[PDB]
PDB file of C-alpha atoms in Angstrom:
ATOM      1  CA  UNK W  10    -105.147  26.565  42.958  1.00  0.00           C
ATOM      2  CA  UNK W  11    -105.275  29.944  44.443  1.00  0.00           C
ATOM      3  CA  UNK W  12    -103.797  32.875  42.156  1.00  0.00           C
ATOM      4  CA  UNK W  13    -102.265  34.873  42.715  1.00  0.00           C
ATOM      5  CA  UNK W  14    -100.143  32.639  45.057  1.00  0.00           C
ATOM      6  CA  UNK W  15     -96.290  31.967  45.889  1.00  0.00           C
ATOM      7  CA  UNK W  16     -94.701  28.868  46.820  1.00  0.00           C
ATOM      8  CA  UNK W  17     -91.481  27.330  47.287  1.00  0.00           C
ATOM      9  CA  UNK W  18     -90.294  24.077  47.627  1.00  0.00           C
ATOM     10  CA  UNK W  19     -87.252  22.434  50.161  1.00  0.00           C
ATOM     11  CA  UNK W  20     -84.684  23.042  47.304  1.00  0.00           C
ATOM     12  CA  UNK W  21     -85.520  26.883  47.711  1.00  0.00           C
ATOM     13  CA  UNK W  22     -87.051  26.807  43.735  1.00  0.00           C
ATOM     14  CA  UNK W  23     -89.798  29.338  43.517  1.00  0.00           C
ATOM     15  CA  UNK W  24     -93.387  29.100  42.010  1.00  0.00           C
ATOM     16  CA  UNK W  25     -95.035  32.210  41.176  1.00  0.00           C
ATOM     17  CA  UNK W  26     -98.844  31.503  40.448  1.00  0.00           C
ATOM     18  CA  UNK W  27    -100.168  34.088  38.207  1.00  0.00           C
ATOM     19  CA  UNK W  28    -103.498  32.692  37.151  1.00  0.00           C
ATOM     20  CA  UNK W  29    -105.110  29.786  37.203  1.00  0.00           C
ATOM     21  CA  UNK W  30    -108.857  30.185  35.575  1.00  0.00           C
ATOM     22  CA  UNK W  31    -110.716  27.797  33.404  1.00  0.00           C
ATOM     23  CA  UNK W  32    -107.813  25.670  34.882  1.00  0.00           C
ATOM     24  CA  UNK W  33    -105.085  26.395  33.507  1.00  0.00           C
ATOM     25  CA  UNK W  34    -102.203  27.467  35.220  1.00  0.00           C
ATOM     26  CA  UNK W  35    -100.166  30.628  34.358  1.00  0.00           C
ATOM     27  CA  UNK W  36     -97.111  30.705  36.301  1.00  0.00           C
ATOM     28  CA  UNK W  37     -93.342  31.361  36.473  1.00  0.00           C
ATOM     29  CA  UNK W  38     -90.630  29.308  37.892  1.00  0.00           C
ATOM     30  CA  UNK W  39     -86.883  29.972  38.458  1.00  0.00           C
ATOM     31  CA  UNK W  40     -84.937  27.191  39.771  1.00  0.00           C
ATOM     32  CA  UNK W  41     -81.757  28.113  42.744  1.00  0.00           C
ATOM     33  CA  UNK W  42     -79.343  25.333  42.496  1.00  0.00           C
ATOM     34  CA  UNK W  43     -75.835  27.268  42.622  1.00  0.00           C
ATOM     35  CA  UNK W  44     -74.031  25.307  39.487  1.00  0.00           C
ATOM     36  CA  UNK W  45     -77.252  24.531  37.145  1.00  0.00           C
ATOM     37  CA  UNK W  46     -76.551  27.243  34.381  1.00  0.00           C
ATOM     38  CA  UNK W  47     -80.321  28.478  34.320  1.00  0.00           C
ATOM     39  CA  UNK W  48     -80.596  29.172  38.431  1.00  0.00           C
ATOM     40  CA  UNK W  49     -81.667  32.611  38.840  1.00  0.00           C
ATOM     41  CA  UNK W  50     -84.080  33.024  35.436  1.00  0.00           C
ATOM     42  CA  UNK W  51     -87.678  32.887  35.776  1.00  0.00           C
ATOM     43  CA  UNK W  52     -89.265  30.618  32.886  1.00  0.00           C
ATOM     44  CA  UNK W  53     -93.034  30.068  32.479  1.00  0.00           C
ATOM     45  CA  UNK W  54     -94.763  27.372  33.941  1.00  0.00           C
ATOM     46  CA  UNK W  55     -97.827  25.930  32.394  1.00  0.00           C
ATOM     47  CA  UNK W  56    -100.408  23.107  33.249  1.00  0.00           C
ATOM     48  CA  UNK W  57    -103.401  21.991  34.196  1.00  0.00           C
ATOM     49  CA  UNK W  58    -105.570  21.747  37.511  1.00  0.00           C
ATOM     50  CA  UNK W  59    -108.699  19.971  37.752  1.00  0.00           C
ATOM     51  CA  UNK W  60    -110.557  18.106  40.786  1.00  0.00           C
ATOM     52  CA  UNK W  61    -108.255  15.599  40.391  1.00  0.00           C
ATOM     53  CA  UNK W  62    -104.830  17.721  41.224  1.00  0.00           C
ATOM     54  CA  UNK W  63    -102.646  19.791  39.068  1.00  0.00           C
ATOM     55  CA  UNK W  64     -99.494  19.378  36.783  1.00  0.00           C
ATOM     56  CA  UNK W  65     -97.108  22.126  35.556  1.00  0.00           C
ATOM     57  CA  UNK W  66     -94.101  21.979  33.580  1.00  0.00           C
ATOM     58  CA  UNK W  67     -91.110  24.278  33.405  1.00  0.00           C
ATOM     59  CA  UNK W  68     -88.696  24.196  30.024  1.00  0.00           C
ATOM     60  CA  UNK W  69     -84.968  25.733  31.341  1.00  0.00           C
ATOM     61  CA  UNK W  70     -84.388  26.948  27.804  1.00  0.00           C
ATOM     62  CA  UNK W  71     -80.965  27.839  27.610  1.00  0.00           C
ATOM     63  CA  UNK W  72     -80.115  24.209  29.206  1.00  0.00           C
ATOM     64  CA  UNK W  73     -81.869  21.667  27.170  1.00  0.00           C
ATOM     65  CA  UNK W  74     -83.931  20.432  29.712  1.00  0.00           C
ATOM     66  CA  UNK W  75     -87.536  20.356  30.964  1.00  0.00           C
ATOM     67  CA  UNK W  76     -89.301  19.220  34.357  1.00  0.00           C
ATOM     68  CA  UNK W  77     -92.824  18.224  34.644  1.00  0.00           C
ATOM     69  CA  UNK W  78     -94.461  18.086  38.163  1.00  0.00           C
ATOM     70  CA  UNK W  79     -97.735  16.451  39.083  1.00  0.00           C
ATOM     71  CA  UNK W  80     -99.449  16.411  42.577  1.00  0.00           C
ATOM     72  CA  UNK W  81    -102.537  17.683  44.319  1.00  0.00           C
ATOM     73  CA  UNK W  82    -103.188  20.487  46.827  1.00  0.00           C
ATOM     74  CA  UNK W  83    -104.063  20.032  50.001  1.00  0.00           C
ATOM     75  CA  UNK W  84    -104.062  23.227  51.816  1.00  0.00           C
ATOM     76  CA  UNK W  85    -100.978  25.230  52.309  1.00  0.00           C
ATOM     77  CA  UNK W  86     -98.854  21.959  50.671  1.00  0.00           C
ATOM     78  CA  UNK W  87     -98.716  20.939  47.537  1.00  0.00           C
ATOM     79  CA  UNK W  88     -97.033  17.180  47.250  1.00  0.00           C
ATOM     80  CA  UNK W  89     -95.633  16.588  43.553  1.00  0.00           C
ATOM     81  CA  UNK W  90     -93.617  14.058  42.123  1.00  0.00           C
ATOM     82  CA  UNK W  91     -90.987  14.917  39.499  1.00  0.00           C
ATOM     83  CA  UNK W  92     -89.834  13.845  35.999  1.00  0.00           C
ATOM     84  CA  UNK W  93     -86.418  15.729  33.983  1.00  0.00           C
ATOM     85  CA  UNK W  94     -85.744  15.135  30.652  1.00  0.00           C
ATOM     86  CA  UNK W  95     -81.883  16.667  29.936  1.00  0.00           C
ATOM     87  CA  UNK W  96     -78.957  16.107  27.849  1.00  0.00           C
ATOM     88  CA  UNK W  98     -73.250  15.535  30.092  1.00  0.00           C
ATOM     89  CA  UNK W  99     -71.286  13.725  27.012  1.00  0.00           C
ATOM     90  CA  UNK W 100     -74.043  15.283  25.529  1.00  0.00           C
ATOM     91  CA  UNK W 101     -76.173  12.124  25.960  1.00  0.00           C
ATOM     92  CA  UNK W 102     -80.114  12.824  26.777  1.00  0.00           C
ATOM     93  CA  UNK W 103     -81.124  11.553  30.181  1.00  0.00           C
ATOM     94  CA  UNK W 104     -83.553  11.037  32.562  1.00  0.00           C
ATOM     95  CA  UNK W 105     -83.979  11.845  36.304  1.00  0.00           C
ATOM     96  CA  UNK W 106     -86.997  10.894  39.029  1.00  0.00           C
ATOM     97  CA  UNK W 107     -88.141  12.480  42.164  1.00  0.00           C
ATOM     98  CA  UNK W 108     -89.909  14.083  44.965  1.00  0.00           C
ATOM     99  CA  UNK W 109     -91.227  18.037  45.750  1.00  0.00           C
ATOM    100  CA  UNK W 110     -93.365  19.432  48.095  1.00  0.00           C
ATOM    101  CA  UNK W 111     -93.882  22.743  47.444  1.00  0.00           C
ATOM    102  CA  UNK W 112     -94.922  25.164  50.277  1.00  0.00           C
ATOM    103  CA  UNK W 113     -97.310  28.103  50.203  1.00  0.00           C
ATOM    104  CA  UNK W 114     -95.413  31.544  50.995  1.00  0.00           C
ATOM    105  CA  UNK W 115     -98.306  34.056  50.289  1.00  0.00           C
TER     106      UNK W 115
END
């Protein structure tokens, strides 16, 4: 994982890469979905990337809800796939999916 490095995936969320030495990954994340109540804050991503790939996970604080990604690098593109653990009844719930997130600088 170069650091430090930018990248962005097709949803327009950012990844600022701060660090990434003795693998870990220090990072921040902010999220752009117009109507998610914690678009538009940067929280801290942290993970681990090995030979293997990488994961990171982001924690949207002030929304109950966390994302973990896991993926690889290859080049410029970094494939992930998705997992979000949320609470709207207030009920907990679970949602699946797809990023690839795209080197800026």
């Amino acid at each position: 994982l170069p650091a430090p490095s930018y990248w962005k995936n097709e949803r327009g969320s950012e990844l600022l890469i701060w660090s990434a030495n003795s693998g870990t990954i220090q990072g921040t994340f902010t999220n752009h979905a117009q109507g998610f109540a914690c678009q538009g804050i940067p929280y801290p991503a942290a993970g681990s990337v090995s030979p293997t790939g990488l994961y990171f996970v982001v924690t949207f604080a002030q929304c109950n809800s966390f994302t973990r990604w896991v993926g690889t690098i290859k080049g410029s593109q970094m494939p992930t796939s998705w997992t979000l653990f949320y609470v709207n009844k207030g009920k907990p719930s679970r949602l699946k999916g797809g990023d690839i997130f795209t080197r800026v600088w």
